[PDB]
Amino acid sequence: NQSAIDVVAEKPSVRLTPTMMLYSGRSHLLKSGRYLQQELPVRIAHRIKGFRSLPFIIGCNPTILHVHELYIRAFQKLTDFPPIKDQADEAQYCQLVRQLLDDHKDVVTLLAEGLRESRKHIEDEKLVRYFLDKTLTSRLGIRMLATHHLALHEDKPDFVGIICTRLSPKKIIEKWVDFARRLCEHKYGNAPRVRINGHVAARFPFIPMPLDYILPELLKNAMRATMESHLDTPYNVPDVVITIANNDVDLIIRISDRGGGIAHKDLDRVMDYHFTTAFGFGLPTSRAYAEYLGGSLQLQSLQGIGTDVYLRLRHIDGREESFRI
Amino acid sequence: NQSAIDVVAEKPSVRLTPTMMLYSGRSHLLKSGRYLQQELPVRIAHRIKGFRSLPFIIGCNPTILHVHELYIRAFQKLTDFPPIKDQADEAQYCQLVRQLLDDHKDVVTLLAEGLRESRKHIEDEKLVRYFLDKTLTSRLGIRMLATHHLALHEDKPDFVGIICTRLSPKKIIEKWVDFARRLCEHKYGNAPRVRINGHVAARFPFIPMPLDYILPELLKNAMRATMESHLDTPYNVPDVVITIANNDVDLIIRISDRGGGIAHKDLDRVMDYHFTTAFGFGLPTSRAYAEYLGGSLQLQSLQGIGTDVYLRLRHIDGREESFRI
Numbered sequence A, B: 001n002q003s004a005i006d007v008v009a010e011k012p013s014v015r016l017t018p019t020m021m022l023y024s025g026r027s028h029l030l031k032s033g034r035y036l037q038q039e040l041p042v043r044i045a046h047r048i049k050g051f052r053s054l055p056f057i058i059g060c061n062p063t064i065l066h067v068h069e070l071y072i073r074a075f076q077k078l079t080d081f082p083p084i085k086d087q088a089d090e091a092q093y094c095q096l097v098r099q100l101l102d103d104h105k106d107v108v109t110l111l112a113e114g115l116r117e118s119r120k121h122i123e124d125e126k127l128v129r130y131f132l133d134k135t136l137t138s139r140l141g142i143r144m145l146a147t148h149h150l151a152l153h154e155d156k157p158d159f160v161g162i163i164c165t166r167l168s169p170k171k172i173i174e175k176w177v178d179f180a181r182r183l184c185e186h187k188y189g190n191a192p193r194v195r196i197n198g199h200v201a202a203r204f205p206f207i208p209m210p211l212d213y214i215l216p217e218l219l220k221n222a223m224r225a226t227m228e229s230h231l232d233t234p235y236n237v238p239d240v241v242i243t244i245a246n247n248d249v250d251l252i253i254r255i256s257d258r259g260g261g262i263a264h265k266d267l268d269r270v271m272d273y274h275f276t277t278a279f280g281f282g283l284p285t286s287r288a289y290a291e292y293l294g295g296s297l298q299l300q301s302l303q304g305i306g307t308d309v310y311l312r313l314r315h316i317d318g319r320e321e322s323f324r325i
């Protein structure tokens, strides 16, 4: 809790849209590196401010305290590093960014553990939701900016940093379907087949990074629900049907399962952090990530039949607003 | 605007649940007839109060004024009729009920016309929504009570008045699919095939009367959208898929079309009364009817693909609350 953190804790974020980054990703690495150097300490200070504002009994949890202390250590490193003048200065910063990206890889796990240890002192799940939605999405934003900058140094086909210039939703969904079906097959001996329909030929600019979190979570929920509701017929289960709708405004991905649905008693709890019928972070984090990206995650439960999950995400066309929750 | 209307205009409604009516539908016609005689003038007075509360410029529309005057005439008839003592008194009342049911058959049409003539003097569509939602659902309630009482005199198989003791959602949906496909075929030369899945064998107590309004409206929307989006391939159109989910709490009917979806610009207008892309009452009346019955009507639009409409209705099991909006 030093005075340097206090100076930028209330300072507004200078937000850049993926379009702005795509135009620079066409001298431009120096302007980009300068932005990160000045903007990342502000984002880290906003996270520290969040920990400072937690109720005392929650902030005292040594696991919560440890994540708070990790963010203070990251602010110290980001500010104590000298400014960027030449290209070798921009390159020295990339190495610090690589190190901080790895030191904070398990923050969400530690935060879930801290939340769990403090369950008896909560009483307001809406306040837990605001803290975690803001912390995890601001963390997503920091990781996206940091990873994009590292990836700008590379000349990877169909990528401008972490922006895929021709992302196919069908291919990204197919990659995670194969990943999910294998885990499900190892647990139940079988997995539902996944059919993909709609705008299967869609290709457009998109950052796959948040879809790499959302898609396995939603597929795992759909497949586990399907298997749990058909234990008496486990080698003859209904397919999971994924429809892609692509238009000028947004991308919609509907994941429809025949997994029995979300019961009426659980319906208002599934979106709370740590609520589970088996981690409990899959749905509320996916919803927060979709909101951060200018979209949404909505559920329609048909109790006794199955669930329809709608993931809506905005395009990158020079019309989109900046990412924020 | 007489003093007799003033006496009961603020008097709370004495609400009966369909379970209460089903137990009586097992001496019981006199107790039922007594209820209608004392309760219907109160419901009519609540409608008059609604017309009295309309903004002056709207209430002045001679078409709105005419519906207001029709309700005053109905209150006069309901109160000026003598009380029910013997069974022939209960039977004399049935004839007045039959006559009033017919004199008000076109109220919604006149109200739509009055709303249309006053479009330039509205400015608040949320206030139009509250008036019409309340007027049309209270009207639904009056018609349901009046029709149920007439139908109690008959011994119709699987019916206790207007309560079907073993309503099959598949059969009622099939009846209206045949009705809708014929209108659609006469307009476009072809109609989408309707497939029904889910709990196709479900049978339970239910009042079909509101489903007889909601189902043709939703089917017409699904079929018109499908044809309008496939004009270049009109004899090869995608099916409309209806799923039935029945559980202890509610009945869910999902109507999924491949009709291109509800555009982003129209999405917040489709639920307004008189909004249409071709009457404009189908969706907002269906939503109000579903809410009145303890359920809901929700839409999920996949722009460029189609729409999923979810109609949720509560069961009649001795646990349901009374109908109200």
Ligand SMILES: Nc1ncnc2c1ncn2[C@@H]1O[C@H](COP(=O)(O)OP(=O)(O)O)[C@@H](O)[C@H]1O
Pocket: A217, A221, A222, A225, A257, A259, A260, A261, A262, A266, A270, A275, A276, A277, A278, A279, A280, A281, A282, A283, A284, A306, A307
């Ligand atoms: N498709 C679905 N069908 C049925 N239940 C579901 C579905 N998706 C999620 N759920 C329910 O919501 C709960 C919370 O899900 P989630 O937040 O992703 O956490 P986790 O997957 O670790 O349980 C699940 O435990 C399950 O009860």
Ligand SMILES: Nc1ncnc2c1ncn2[C@@H]1O[C@H](COP(=O)(O)OP(=O)(O)O)[C@@H](O)[C@H]1O
Pocket: B217, B221, B222, B225, B257, B259, B260, B261, B262, B266, B270, B275, B276, B277, B278, B279, B280, B281, B282, B283, B284, B306, B307
């Ligand atoms: N399934 C659907 N797919 C696409 N558009 C729809 C669908 N259902 C309704 N709409 C849109 O919503 C508007 C309002 O519908 P509605 O209130 O039922 O009135 P109406 O049927 O007389 O036009 C329609 O005119 C149409 O533009």
Ligand SMILES: COc1ccc(-c2nnn[nH]2)cc1
Pocket: A040, A074, A078, A096, A097, A100, A101, A104, A105, A107, A139, A142, A143, A146
């Ligand atoms: C300077 O670059 C970074 C990148 C990532 C984090 C982070 N990830 N999770 N929590 N903090 C912190 C700093």
Ligand SMILES: COc1ccc(-c2nnn[nH]2)cc1
Pocket: A054, A055, A058, A064, A114, A115, A116, A118, A122, A124, A127, A128, A129, A131, A132
């Ligand atoms: C461990 O994570 C949390 C986050 C937030 C709260 C909170 N905010 N307001 N009241 N309780 C409690 C626990």
Ligand SMILES: COc1ccc(-c2nnn[nH]2)cc1
Pocket: A015, A016, A017, A018, A021, A140, A141, A142, A144, A145, A148, A161, A162, A163, A207, A323
């Ligand atoms: C690759 O392009 C971008 C652009 C913007 C962000 C961002 N801004 N705020 N949080 N994340 C992340 C990546």
Ligand SMILES: COc1ccc(-c2nnn[nH]2)cc1
Pocket: B040, B074, B078, B096, B097, B100, B101, B104, B105, B107, B139, B142, B143, B146
């Ligand atoms: C006494 O029975 C009735 C039945 C129906 C109405 C009605 N329908 N629409 N508007 N008023 C009025 C009275």
Ligand SMILES: COc1ccc(-c2nnn[nH]2)cc1
Pocket: B054, B055, B058, B064, B114, B115, B116, B118, B122, B124, B127, B128, B129, B131, B132
């Ligand atoms: C013709 O139908 C109506 C109903 C209600 C209003 C209203 N209520 N409040 N402000 N305008 C206007 C017109």
Ligand SMILES: COc1ccc(-c2nnn[nH]2)cc1
Pocket: B015, B016, B017, B018, B021, B140, B141, B142, B144, B145, B148, B161, B162, B163, B207, B323
């Ligand atoms: C056949 O059983 C019933 C029960 C209740 C109503 C009602 N109450 N209020 N409005 N409609 C209508 C019919």
Ligand SMILES: [K+]
Pocket: A269, A270, A271, A272, A273, A274, A275, A276, A280, A281, A282, A283, A284
């Ligand atoms: K959860």
Ligand SMILES: [K+]
Pocket: B269, B270, B271, B272, B273, B274, B275, B276, B280, B281, B282, B283, B284
């Ligand atoms: K409408």
Ligand SMILES: [Mg+2]
Pocket: A216, A217, A218, A220, A221, A281, A282, A283
């Ligand atoms: Mg999950």
Ligand SMILES: [Mg+2]
Pocket: B216, B217, B218, B220, B221, B281, B282, B283
């Ligand atoms: Mg209609």
